[PDB]
Protein backbone atom coordinates (compact mmCIF):
# COMPACT_ATOMS: atom_id res chain seq x y z
CA UNK A 1 0.00 0.00 0.00
CA UNK A 2 1.01 3.62 -0.61
CA UNK A 3 -0.31 6.60 1.36
CA UNK A 4 1.75 9.59 0.16
CA UNK A 5 2.36 10.69 -3.43
CA UNK A 6 5.29 13.08 -3.92
CA UNK A 7 4.28 13.57 -7.59
CA UNK A 8 1.05 15.47 -6.86
CA UNK A 9 0.68 19.26 -6.65
CA UNK A 10 0.68 20.02 -2.90
CA UNK A 11 3.20 17.28 -1.95
CA UNK A 12 5.65 18.49 -4.61
CA UNK A 13 5.06 22.08 -3.50
CA UNK A 14 5.93 21.16 0.10
CA UNK A 15 8.94 19.20 -1.20
CA UNK A 16 10.27 22.25 -3.06
CA UNK A 17 9.46 24.41 -0.02
CA UNK A 18 11.58 22.35 2.37
CA UNK A 19 14.29 22.00 -0.29
CA UNK A 20 14.50 25.79 -0.61
CA UNK A 21 14.26 26.31 3.17
CA UNK A 22 17.17 23.90 3.77
CA UNK A 23 19.92 25.37 1.56
CA UNK A 24 20.29 28.46 3.77
CA UNK A 25 20.13 26.88 7.25
CA UNK A 26 21.11 23.28 7.94
CA UNK A 27 18.42 21.04 9.41
CA UNK A 28 19.12 18.91 12.48
CA UNK A 29 18.64 15.65 10.54
CA UNK A 30 18.87 15.04 6.81
CA UNK A 31 15.76 14.74 4.63
CA UNK A 32 16.87 11.98 2.24
CA UNK A 33 14.42 9.13 1.59
CA UNK A 34 11.59 10.52 3.76
CA UNK A 35 9.27 8.17 5.63
CA UNK A 36 5.50 8.34 5.97
CA UNK A 37 5.87 9.29 9.64
CA UNK A 38 7.31 12.68 8.68
CA UNK A 39 4.31 13.39 6.45
CA UNK A 40 2.01 12.20 9.24
CA UNK A 41 3.60 14.62 11.72
CA UNK A 42 3.37 17.40 9.13
CA UNK A 43 -0.33 16.71 8.62
CA UNK A 44 -0.89 16.60 12.38
CA UNK A 45 0.84 19.95 12.86
CA UNK A 46 -1.29 21.41 10.07
CA UNK A 47 -4.44 19.96 11.67
CA UNK A 48 -3.57 21.48 15.04
CA UNK A 49 -2.80 24.84 13.42
CA UNK A 50 -6.09 24.88 11.49
CA UNK A 51 -8.03 23.89 14.61
Amino acid at each position, epitope marked *: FQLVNYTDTIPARIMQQW*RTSDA*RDHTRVDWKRPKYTSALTYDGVKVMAEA
Partner: single-chain antibody
Framework: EVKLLESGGGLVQPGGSLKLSCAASGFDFSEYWMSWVRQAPGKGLEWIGEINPDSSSIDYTPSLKDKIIISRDNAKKTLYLQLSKVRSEDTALYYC????????????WGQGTSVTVNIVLTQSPASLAVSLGQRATISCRASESVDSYGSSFVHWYQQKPGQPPKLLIFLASKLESGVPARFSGSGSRTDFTLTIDPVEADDAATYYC?????????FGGGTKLEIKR
Protein backbone atom coordinates in the same frame (compact mmCIF):
# COMPACT_ATOMS: atom_id res chain seq x y z
CA GLU B 1 29.08 10.30 -6.07
CA VAL B 2 28.20 13.20 -8.37
CA LYS B 3 31.08 14.67 -10.39
CA LEU B 4 30.26 17.90 -12.24
CA LEU B 5 32.49 18.42 -15.28
CA GLU B 6 32.80 22.03 -16.41
CA SER B 7 33.38 23.01 -20.03
CA GLY B 8 34.39 26.27 -21.67
CA GLY B 9 37.74 27.08 -20.08
CA GLY B 10 39.51 30.06 -21.60
CA LEU B 11 39.42 33.81 -21.99
CA VAL B 12 36.78 35.96 -23.70
CA GLN B 13 36.49 39.33 -25.43
CA PRO B 14 34.72 42.39 -23.98
CA GLY B 15 31.08 43.27 -24.45
CA GLY B 16 29.92 39.70 -25.10
CA SER B 17 28.54 37.14 -22.67
CA LEU B 18 30.41 34.24 -21.05
CA LYS B 19 28.19 31.14 -20.93
CA LEU B 20 29.83 28.47 -18.75
CA SER B 21 28.18 25.07 -19.20
CA CYS B 22 29.03 22.36 -16.65
CA ALA B 23 27.81 18.81 -17.26
CA ALA B 24 26.79 16.83 -14.16
CA SER B 25 27.98 13.24 -14.52
CA GLY B 26 26.90 10.26 -12.43
CA PHE B 27 23.20 11.10 -12.19
CA ASP B 28 20.71 13.95 -12.58
CA PHE B 29 20.30 16.99 -10.33
CA SER B 30 16.49 16.82 -10.14
CA GLU B 31 16.43 15.68 -6.49
CA TYR B 32 19.70 17.41 -5.51
CA TRP B 33 20.23 21.15 -5.19
CA MET B 34 22.71 23.14 -7.28
CA SER B 35 24.83 26.24 -6.82
CA TRP B 36 27.38 28.17 -8.91
CA VAL B 37 29.73 30.08 -6.59
CA ARG B 38 32.76 31.87 -8.01
CA GLN B 39 36.18 31.80 -6.35
CA ALA B 40 38.94 34.39 -6.50
CA PRO B 41 42.64 33.57 -7.01
CA GLY B 42 44.18 32.85 -3.62
CA LYS B 43 41.17 34.25 -1.76
CA GLY B 44 37.95 32.62 -0.59
CA LEU B 45 34.81 31.82 -2.55
CA GLU B 46 31.76 34.00 -3.27
CA TRP B 47 28.10 32.96 -3.44
CA ILE B 48 26.91 34.33 -6.80
CA GLY B 49 24.18 31.93 -7.90
CA GLU B 50 21.68 30.26 -5.57
CA ILE B 51 19.46 27.53 -7.03
CA ASN B 52 17.27 24.64 -5.87
CA PRO B 53 16.85 20.95 -6.80
CA ASP B 54 14.05 21.49 -9.34
CA SER B 55 15.49 24.93 -10.26
CA SER B 56 12.41 26.69 -8.89
CA SER B 57 13.93 29.61 -6.95
CA ILE B 58 17.03 30.67 -8.90
CA ASP B 59 18.18 33.43 -6.56
CA TYR B 60 20.89 35.83 -7.68
CA THR B 61 23.65 37.51 -5.70
CA PRO B 62 22.92 40.72 -3.75
CA SER B 63 25.48 42.73 -5.75
CA LEU B 64 26.18 40.67 -8.91
CA LYS B 65 22.72 40.25 -10.42
CA ASP B 66 23.77 41.88 -13.71
CA LYS B 67 26.93 39.73 -14.02
CA ILE B 68 25.23 36.32 -13.81
CA ILE B 69 22.30 34.61 -15.54
CA ILE B 70 20.99 31.41 -13.94
CA SER B 71 19.40 29.13 -16.55
CA ARG B 72 19.51 25.36 -16.00
CA ASP B 73 17.28 22.29 -16.25
CA ASN B 74 16.75 19.56 -13.67
CA ALA B 75 15.89 16.91 -16.27
CA LYS B 76 19.00 17.81 -18.30
CA LYS B 77 21.51 18.00 -15.41
CA THR B 78 23.54 20.64 -17.27
CA LEU B 79 23.77 24.09 -15.70
CA TYR B 80 24.76 27.24 -17.59
CA LEU B 81 26.53 30.06 -15.73
CA GLN B 82 25.67 32.71 -18.30
CA LEU B 83 25.77 36.50 -18.01
CA SER B 84 25.17 39.67 -20.03
CA LYS B 85 27.61 42.54 -20.67
CA VAL B 86 30.31 41.44 -18.24
CA ARG B 87 32.71 44.08 -16.93
CA SER B 88 36.50 44.02 -16.64
CA GLU B 89 36.50 43.36 -12.87
CA ASP B 90 34.80 39.97 -13.45
CA THR B 91 38.19 38.24 -13.95
CA ALA B 92 38.07 35.34 -11.49
CA LEU B 93 37.93 31.53 -11.36
CA TYR B 94 34.34 30.43 -11.95
CA TYR B 95 33.26 27.02 -10.68
CA CYS B 96 30.09 25.03 -10.07
CA UNK B 97 29.09 22.86 -7.12
CA UNK B 98 26.68 20.03 -6.36
CA UNK B 99 24.17 20.16 -3.48
CA UNK B 100 26.11 21.24 -0.39
CA UNK B 101 23.81 23.71 1.36
CA UNK B 102 21.14 21.03 1.93
CA UNK B 103 23.10 17.80 1.35
CA UNK B 104 25.79 16.25 3.55
CA UNK B 105 25.89 12.79 1.97
CA UNK B 106 28.12 13.31 -1.09
CA UNK B 107 28.53 17.08 -1.30
CA UNK B 108 31.33 17.93 -3.74
CA TRP B 109 32.09 20.98 -5.85
CA GLY B 110 32.31 20.97 -9.63
CA GLN B 111 35.34 21.03 -11.89
CA GLY B 112 35.59 24.77 -12.55
CA THR B 113 37.03 27.02 -15.22
CA SER B 114 39.55 29.83 -15.67
CA VAL B 115 38.81 33.15 -17.38
CA THR B 116 40.34 36.65 -17.37
CA VAL B 117 37.63 39.14 -18.32
CA ASN B 118 29.90 40.13 12.00
CA ILE B 119 31.52 36.73 11.38
CA VAL B 120 35.32 36.41 11.32
CA LEU B 121 36.21 32.99 9.86
CA THR B 122 39.76 33.02 11.24
CA GLN B 123 41.48 29.62 11.11
CA SER B 124 44.66 28.69 12.97
CA PRO B 125 47.21 27.80 11.94
CA ALA B 126 47.06 29.25 8.42
CA SER B 127 50.40 27.59 7.58
CA LEU B 128 52.13 24.51 8.99
CA ALA B 129 54.33 21.57 8.03
CA VAL B 130 54.02 18.00 9.33
CA SER B 131 56.17 14.96 8.64
CA LEU B 132 55.08 11.84 6.76
CA GLY B 133 52.29 10.03 8.58
CA GLN B 134 52.08 12.71 11.28
CA ARG B 135 48.94 14.17 12.85
CA ALA B 136 47.77 17.79 12.61
CA THR B 137 44.85 19.42 14.44
CA ILE B 138 44.07 22.99 13.38
CA SER B 139 41.44 25.30 14.87
CA CYS B 140 39.02 27.84 13.40
CA ARG B 141 37.64 30.63 15.58
CA ALA B 142 34.59 32.76 14.81
CA SER B 143 33.15 36.08 15.94
CA GLU B 144 29.44 35.24 15.72
CA SER B 145 27.66 32.35 17.45
CA VAL B 146 29.29 28.98 16.72
CA ASP B 147 26.78 26.83 18.65
CA SER B 148 23.74 25.81 16.57
CA TYR B 149 21.71 23.02 18.21
CA GLY B 150 24.82 21.14 19.29
CA SER B 151 25.84 20.03 15.80
CA SER B 152 27.98 22.92 14.55
CA PHE B 153 26.65 23.90 11.10
CA VAL B 154 30.12 24.24 9.59
CA HIS B 155 32.34 22.24 7.23
CA TRP B 156 35.99 22.06 6.17
CA TYR B 157 36.91 22.06 2.47
CA GLN B 158 40.52 21.83 1.26
CA GLN B 159 41.61 23.36 -2.04
CA LYS B 160 44.86 22.95 -3.97
CA PRO B 161 46.58 25.25 -6.49
CA GLY B 162 44.68 24.83 -9.75
CA GLN B 163 42.25 22.23 -8.38
CA PRO B 164 38.67 22.87 -7.24
CA PRO B 165 37.79 23.05 -3.53
CA LYS B 166 36.85 19.54 -2.39
CA LEU B 167 34.73 19.11 0.73
CA LEU B 168 35.98 16.87 3.55
CA ILE B 169 33.53 17.28 6.45
CA PHE B 170 29.89 18.34 6.82
CA LEU B 171 28.08 19.77 9.86
CA ALA B 172 31.03 18.56 12.01
CA SER B 173 29.29 15.18 12.33
CA LYS B 174 29.66 13.43 8.95
CA LEU B 175 32.79 13.36 6.79
CA GLU B 176 32.66 13.39 3.00
CA SER B 177 32.85 10.22 0.92
CA GLY B 178 35.93 8.96 -0.90
CA VAL B 179 38.41 9.88 1.83
CA PRO B 180 38.52 7.39 4.74
CA ALA B 181 37.75 8.11 8.40
CA ARG B 182 40.88 10.20 8.88
CA PHE B 183 39.48 13.75 9.28
CA SER B 184 37.64 14.28 12.58
CA GLY B 185 36.07 17.72 12.96
CA SER B 186 34.66 18.91 16.28
CA GLY B 187 34.17 22.01 18.42
CA SER B 188 32.05 23.07 21.42
CA ARG B 189 30.93 26.71 21.19
CA THR B 190 34.58 27.85 21.08
CA ASP B 191 36.16 27.07 17.69
CA PHE B 192 35.84 24.47 14.95
CA THR B 193 38.74 22.00 15.20
CA LEU B 194 39.47 19.34 12.57
CA THR B 195 42.19 16.74 13.13
CA ILE B 196 43.73 14.83 10.21
CA ASP B 197 45.74 11.66 10.79
CA PRO B 198 47.84 10.32 9.30
CA VAL B 199 49.30 13.01 7.04
CA GLU B 200 49.78 12.04 3.40
CA ALA B 201 51.21 13.61 0.26
CA ASP B 202 47.75 14.06 -1.26
CA ASP B 203 46.74 16.35 1.63
CA ALA B 204 49.32 18.96 0.49
CA ALA B 205 46.81 21.72 -0.23
CA THR B 206 45.26 24.83 1.35
CA TYR B 207 42.46 23.91 3.74
CA TYR B 208 39.62 26.26 4.65
CA CYS B 209 36.92 26.11 7.34
CA UNK B 210 33.58 27.40 6.05
CA UNK B 211 30.45 27.89 8.17
CA UNK B 212 26.91 27.96 6.76
CA UNK B 213 25.22 29.11 9.99
CA UNK B 214 26.31 32.75 9.62
CA UNK B 215 26.76 35.29 6.84
CA UNK B 216 28.60 34.95 4.64
CA UNK B 217 28.61 31.26 3.68
CA UNK B 218 31.95 31.53 1.88
CA PHE B 219 35.40 30.06 2.44
CA GLY B 220 37.35 30.92 5.59
CA GLY B 221 40.74 32.55 5.97
CA GLY B 222 42.56 29.61 4.39
CA THR B 223 44.93 27.17 6.10
CA LYS B 224 47.90 26.08 4.01
CA LEU B 225 48.92 22.47 4.68
CA GLU B 226 52.37 21.43 3.45
CA ILE B 227 53.41 17.78 3.72
CA LYS B 228 57.00 18.13 4.91
CA ARG B 229 59.45 15.23 4.69
Amino acid sequence: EVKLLESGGGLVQPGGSLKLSCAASGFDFSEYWMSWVRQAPGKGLEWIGEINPDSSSIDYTPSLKDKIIISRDNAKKTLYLQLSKVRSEDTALYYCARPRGNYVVMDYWGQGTSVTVNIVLTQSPASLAVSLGQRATISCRASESVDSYGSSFVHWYQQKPGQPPKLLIFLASKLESGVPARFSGSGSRTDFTLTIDPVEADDAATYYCQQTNEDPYTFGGGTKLEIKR
